[PDB]
Design a protein around this ligand. Structure first.
Ligand SMILES: N#C[C@@]1(c2ccc3c(N)ncnn23)O[C@H](CO)[C@@H](O)[C@H]1O
Length: 169
């Protein structure tokens, strides 16, 4: 039970070099955040790792939701089951700047976290979404007021995030 091994960046933002799936299985948090696309297709990265850990139950539930909803908006979210990982999964769509989606929508994406007391989360709009990860962490720190536990799988990205956050003091 309980989050451990996090570096406290602000009063409400914590960060750890860890697999978000391993964190969820250890802690069983109320909310785990998925780094989603508008169609909630959980093919790769965080989304793939979460869906795999649910043995595809997350994808089947996502497909049912999108059939009633249509695609999410960029900057938008939905609350679905956290299945065996968490009580809830908050699927959030950050902007993909590779497709010329507006970086400002990254503010809208993180704003969704404020509807949840505590979240286990990845960094939004990094990897294939092509946003500057150091900017993403700044938007998170400036936008989120609830407790967020950031799980960053890649050691090199984690070290870059932590040392750039400390160097700006
Ligand atoms: N680091 C990292 C990643 C990632 C991929 C897979 C995982 C995982 N299993 N746990 C946590 N993080 N994680 O999260 C960010 C999401 O935009 C990107 O930088 C990804 O590369």
């Amino acid at each position: 039970n309980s989050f451990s091994g996090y570096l406290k960046l602000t009063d409400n933002v914590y960060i750890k070099n860890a697999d978000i799936v391993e964190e969820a299985k250890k802690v069983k948090p109320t909310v785990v955040v998925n780094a989603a696309n508008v169609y909630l297709k959980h093919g790769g990265g965080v989304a793939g790792a979460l869906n795999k850990a649910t043995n595809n139950a997350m994808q089947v539930e996502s497909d049912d939701y999108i059939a009633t909803n249509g695609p999410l908006k960029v900057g938008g979210s939905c609350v679905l089951s956290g299945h065996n990982l968490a009580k809830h999964c908050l699927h959030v769509v950050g902007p993909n700047v590779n497709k010329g989606e507006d970086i400002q929508l990254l503010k809208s994406a993180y704003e969704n976290f404020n509807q949840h007391e505590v979240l286990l989360a990845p960094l939004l709009s990094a990897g294939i979404f092509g946003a500057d990860p150091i900017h993403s962490l700044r938007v998170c720190v400036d936008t989120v007021r609830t407790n967020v536990y950031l799980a960053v799988f890649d050691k090199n990205l984690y070290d870059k995030l932590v040392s750039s956050f400390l160097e700006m003091k």
